[PDB]
Every structure is written in C-alpha cells, then in structure tokens.
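Long-time lurker, finally posting.

We've been working with Alpha-N-acetylglucosaminidase family protein (Clostridium perfringens) and I want a structural starting point before designing mutants. I don't trust myself to interpret raw outputs, so I'm hoping someone here can both generate the structure tokens and explain anything notable. Sequence follows.
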Amino acid sequence: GVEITEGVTVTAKGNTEGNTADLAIDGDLSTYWESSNDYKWIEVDLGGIYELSKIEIFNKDEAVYKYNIYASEDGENFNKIAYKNNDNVSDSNGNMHTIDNVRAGKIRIDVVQNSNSDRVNIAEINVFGKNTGESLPEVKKIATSNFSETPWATEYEKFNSDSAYANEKTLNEIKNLVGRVIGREFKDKFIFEIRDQLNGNDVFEVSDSGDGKVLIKGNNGVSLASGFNYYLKNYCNVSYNPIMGSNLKMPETMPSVGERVVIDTPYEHRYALNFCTYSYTMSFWDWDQYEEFLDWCAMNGVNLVLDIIGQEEVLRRTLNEFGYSDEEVKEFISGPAYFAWFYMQNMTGFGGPLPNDWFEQRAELGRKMHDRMQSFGINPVLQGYSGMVPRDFKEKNQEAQTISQGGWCGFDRPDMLKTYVNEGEADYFQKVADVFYEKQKEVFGDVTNFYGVDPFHEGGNTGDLDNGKIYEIIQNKMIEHDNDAVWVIQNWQGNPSNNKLEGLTKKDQAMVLDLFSEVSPDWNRLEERDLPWIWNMLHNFGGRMGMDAAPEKLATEIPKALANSEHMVGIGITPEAINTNPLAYELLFDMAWTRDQINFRTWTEDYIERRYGKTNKEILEAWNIILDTAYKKRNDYYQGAAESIINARPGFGIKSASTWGHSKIVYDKSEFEKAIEIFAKNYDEFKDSDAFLYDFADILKQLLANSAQEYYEVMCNAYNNGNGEKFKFVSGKFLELIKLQERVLSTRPEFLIGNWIEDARTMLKDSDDWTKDLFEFNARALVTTWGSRNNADGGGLKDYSNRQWSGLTEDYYYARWEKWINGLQAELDGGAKAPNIDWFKMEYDWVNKKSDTDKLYPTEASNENLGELAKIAMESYSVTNMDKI
Ligand SMILES: CC(=O)N[C@@H]1[C@@H](O)[C@H](O)[C@@H](CO)N[C@@H]1CO
Ligand SMILES: [Ca+2]
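Top reply, 14 upvotes:
Generated this for you. Predicted structure of Alpha-N-acetylglucosaminidase family protein:
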C-alpha cells in the first residue's frame, strides 16, 4: 500500500474563487478546494487502476465534516467504499480510512456536511494502494435509438394504418385492463365492442349479452374502460383506485344489467396532471405504477394527459446541436425529483447530474406509454418550446440573443432566447425551436397534436419584448412543425395576461387550463376571448395531506360553467400530487358524464358504499359529518389542506408549515371528532375493507393534527406566562400526541417514507451506489428542505411538500419539536435564554443520510388497530375531552 504520488488529477463541478479542485491534491495543507454550489464533490483520477488500502482526508479547519467516498474500476460505476458520519471534529492529523483492497481507477468524495458553513472543503486527499498495471476502459458515450429504428415505430404505424389491427389492439388491451384491475378470471365475462360517437360526443353502452356476459360498447378505448368502470360501480358495488384505496370484491355471479344504458360526455377532453405531479408523486414510478395510473385514467374517462417522460433525451439531442456536450447537458438538467420546475423554467441542475443510462431508459419508458395511450385513445401533451436555454448559451453561440430570467426561490432560472430579434441579428429562437421539435419527433415520433409550454411561469423577464408578439411567434413556430398543433397553456394567478393571450392569432389552436377552478376560477377572461379552455380542480398542493375537498362545488359549478359558456372544451384535474382525498377526484371525473347539476350528498352516499363494499346508517352519519365539516363548501382563498402544526418548524405564533399554506381549521373540531367515534364503533365490521382503513387513518390523523394545534396554543401560553411546570406537562402531552400520530401513520403503506425512498433508490436497474445515494437525496430533500439553504429559507420553500408520513414524523417532525421544547424548558427552569435554532442545518442533516449506512426505513406497514388507536386519541389526546386532559 504505497502512497500514489504521481499522475493524480482531479475535477470538480464548482469552486469558490481561487479554491480550485487541484488545490485538494497539491500536497499543501494550507490550500484547499472549497465548494461554491450544491455540487459538493470532487473526482480524483489515479492515473491507473490501484487496489486501494487507505484514503486520507484533511479539511481546512476544525469543523465536523461528514462525507461519502466512492470508487470506480470500470469508469462508469461508482460504488461506495467508505464514509465518515460520526460527529468527530477534523484536526491536524486528518482522517484515515481503511479500504479493503478495492480496485479503483477513479474516486469520488462527496462532502455532505460541514458544521461550520454551508460550503464544504478538502485541504488534502491522499490515496494509498498498489498498482495493478491496468488502465480504466474508455467509457461508452451516450447512445439512444431513433424512434423510426425501433419496434415501437412499426407498431405505432400499424395501429395508424390498419383499422382492424387497431381495433383488435384496443379491444384486447381493454380485456387486459379487466384482468389487471379485478382479476384474470373475469376477462371472459365481458364482450367489448367499438361503436361510433353519439352526435360528436364520446359515449359508452353497458347491457346484457343474453348468456350472462356483460356487453360494453364505446367509441374508443377510454369510453370502453369508462363503461367497464360504470358497470363495476353501479352493479358490482366495486370501486377502483390503485393509489388511494379500492374495493375490488366481485360478486359470485356477474350481476345482470337489466335495461341497457347509454351515457355520453359533452366534453372533448378530460384532462389530468400538473407539471408538479411528475415530482411530488411520480418521480420514482416504474412502469407498473404508470400502467395502473393509465388503467385508472381510462376508467375515469381521462383522454388528455401531460407527458414529460424522457424529455431529457429530447433536450440532450437539441443542446448537442448548439455546442453542449452530454456532460454539460447533465449539469443543466435537474435531478429526478425536480423535473416539474426544470421544465417550467424555474430551476436548473439541482439534484443532478442524472446518470448516463438515464436517457435511453426514460425514452423507452416514454415510448412504452405512448403505445398504451394510443391503444386507449389517450392524448399525451408533449413539449412546446419557448426559448429556454442555459445561462452560458451565448458563450457557446455568440450571435444568440438571450434574456436573463433572474431567480426563483433562490434558484437560477435558465435564460430565455429573445423570441424575435432585429434585422441583421441572428434568430436563435427559430434555430433552436426548429431543432427542438425535430428532435422530439426523433425520440417519440408523431404521437400527439397537443404541446405544453409556459414561458414566464411564476416570474422571468420579458426584457424589451412585446408580450403579445411573444405568444404570436411561439404559437406560429409550433404550428409550423405540426399544422394541427394545439398549445396547452396554464392559467395560474392571472398569468399569462390578456395581452399575452391576445397575441395568439389562431385561437382554435390554443387551449388554456384554468388551473384552480374549484377555489379561484379564472376562465371568464378566457371565454371572453374565445379561447378554448378547460375547467380544472387543483385541490392538492405539494402533496400536503389532510381532510379537504369541495364536492358541492364540483357537483354544481361544473355543469353551471358548461351552461354559461361556448369555449369550455373539457374538465380536468391539476393536482400537484395525487395522494389525498380520493372522493374529490372520483367526483370530478364523474361530472364529465352529466350536463345537469347533481346532489353531492346522495352521490357521496353511493360512493362510500361501493368504496367500503358495504354501508350502514352509522357510517353514513359519520360521512355527513365529514361533509358538514372538512368537506364543507367554503368561499375563501386557500391552497390545499389545512396544515398540521406537527409538520411546521417550531416557533411562536405558527400559522402554517409551508410559506404559502394555512393551518386554520375552518370547521368545529369537536364536531369532526364524532366521525372518528363512529368509525371506531364500526371498525370491527368494516375492517376487512382496505379503503375503510385508508379513510379511518385519514380522519384519525386529521383528529390528532387538529388537537395538536390546541395543545400547542396552550403550550405557548404556559411559556409566555412563565409557568414552567405547566409547560412541561402540556409539552409532554404534545410529544405523546405525536407518538400516537406516528402509530396511526404506521398502518398505511402509502404513509411510509421507506417506500418513497426505496422507489427512488431502485427506479433504474443496475445503477451504482453513487446514483442510488443521489436519488435518495432527491427524495429526502423534496419533502423537507426542498432545496439547500437559500431555497428552503430565503426562497421560502422549506417544508413546502411536508407529508404526514411514518418515519419522517419520528425522525424529522418530532425531533424538531423535541429540540425546541427542551430549549424552552431549560430556560423556564432558570437557565440561559433559549438559543435560536438553525433549523435548516438540522433538517439538511436528515436530508443527507443514506439508507445503506445510517438507517433503513421499513417498507411494510404495521398491524396497529385503528379502532383501538381511535379510542386512545378520544380519551387522552382529543379536543372534546381536552379540559379533563
Ligand atoms: C414549489 C411549488 O410546488 N410551487 C407550485 C408551482 O410550481 C405551481 O405551478 C403552482 C400552481 O400549481 N403551485 C405552487 C406555487 O404556488
Ligand atoms: Ca491543498
């Protein structure tokens, strides 16, 4: 094990001025590399492959550093060979790590923590090993297939050109949906038929075949699956929701339909998904989860779906034509949990770089999905182009004209190409837009006419440019590459302004999603300008959880809008995550199949019976309590469910966990608790229904969140009044309340942080330790600090995506409240005034832990008895009995 003192080089992706990467290997403890951004790692090339025995690391000062060390012997796979995670200070002796004679040609050191500073540093790194005499192999450049080369193109064109082949494909796939949803044994109890549209509208039919089979007709795959769904819900008491709880118990014999049914929808489009859904929910989904979602979409009538899968390969091909290497593209693109804000032009780089094999795998996932969407008749919304480029685009393309977009929550927005230039100037918008659309075809082929792009989303800068001309040129360029193109435009807090929208010269080739129609509708100005538009329920913000829904508005306002408009072309959901309140989403898509207002109370009565497989007068009573409290119609502005005090940074006078959220419970808390009492009383009868268990946990965790808020206010008066003994008692019950909450959360697999993290770590096959640790960082950061310090704090993003999740509650939310409570108690006991707590440092310490070295979170839910937990909460942690407590 001889020290390697020749041929050693190093790179980094960032450094503060005069603290370059090479200063970590110059044999001088007085010079150091220091990080300047969130790339906190350096990569050492050893000038050959050595079997390493020791790695020695010196820091620039005496802080507590934590870091992870990776090695590669093939040039591609960097696996973890050592780490420091104890709390020892660095000193002048350095830290020496034993390596077990691991072959390595390259080494990565990632300094994730410095107790003294946001920035990390390495003064010296020495490596000890024996030469093997071998050199690393040249690593294969990124290669991806053109669509036309693949079997996907063959199958896609065959569907297009052969109506008989396509109908057989659609009918066979619908049969496969039946098998996946309710069981293979039910596939041959259904006969599916393509029919025509009913006077220009999508339509389905359900009826008896004559021999005890169910005959379902529909004009395309979505209508057929919606007919299948209609039959399950109205004749089988069955309810399908692969994300939020199902009752799939089929009768012993197929129920007969009786009088035939024909049902159509007046909406050309039924739309689903926010850009944000691709991050807060779908970041680590595999094909199995996409297939389920599409089965559920088709069954709920969905036929228009935002689709950004594999767009990284589209952008790689595009930027490669303008002076960007693959490595530079990977630095530009974000990590896997941040594509929502990368493609909305809000942020770059953070969470990356993506692995090299990312690009082909995701292009293949996208092609897989377009085949299934084609079978069903679901239109994807691919990408438009508006001028997004990296900030160094002019450095590489000197004649290009760009506009700096400034910051977004402490992130650097990408630049924007000037949408038009002067005569004599080069028009790189035309150049890059031409390539972008052409490369998108190369990756996926002609799969849709709908394209989504949103310049100046939540900021940016229009420079000297005219707002209307900008939108005129973007649309014209889109139509140039697809004559039937429809630009799908988000409508969010009054933007894009009327002046922007009036620049659209082809109104029929634009479609505006009114993003927030169930709380802050903004479609009148779209309707006035004869712009096709869609009525959308947003409902969910950041995946933040709680009992919250607007069923009365859905049942009334949607048909009212259709009766008072001419350019309402559909309805949709725009949730930032799909993880809460399945009633809201079931009801929205149901409103596609009526032109009249419906009764939301009686609809809910039918819904819960098929959701639980059974019903009675007590369960119905509890849900009418829910309808009169958490789901009651309101007329204020609010973003998502009222937040749980448990999830907020501890402090005085807290009114929300997120920056733009709300913690006020607008219903009577003791009234709502009656729903929990009724669920507990009927637990033993309904416990065989997983959806009942799902909803029980939902209302019970809402109960403990509601009561915790009351205990916090008491806890706060005790301190402000100096009553130490009372504070100790109230805060003791508070922490005990959270402990009980953790047990409730533990019962649901949907609430386990271990599932979120494991999905991140396993979403690619044959990925190295480096990639797994980096993906886990994406998963941990998104639901806590969101970004690093300037994003969480100065940017306002801290706890934006806070989740009432198992494990995360124990190790994050409880830990914060415990540390704050201990500080206040010491002060009240005659100690020094409680220090200010740098919350972000503590939070980022959890963000950077790894599942394979620190603590592995479970993927299996517990067996705790919700009914029993409900009794404990009512007796010892409730609002009703709070004065006895
Ligand atoms: C950090 C975040 O998730 N910000 C989202 C933004 O990305 C989204 O466009 C908007 C409308 O859905 N809701 C939030 C902003 O108010
Ligand atoms: Ca040095």
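Before you design anything, note these points.
The pocket of calcium ion (ligand 2) is lined by residues 23-24, 26, 28, 31-32, 123-124 (CB under 6 Å).
Residues 690-720 form the longest helix (31 residues).
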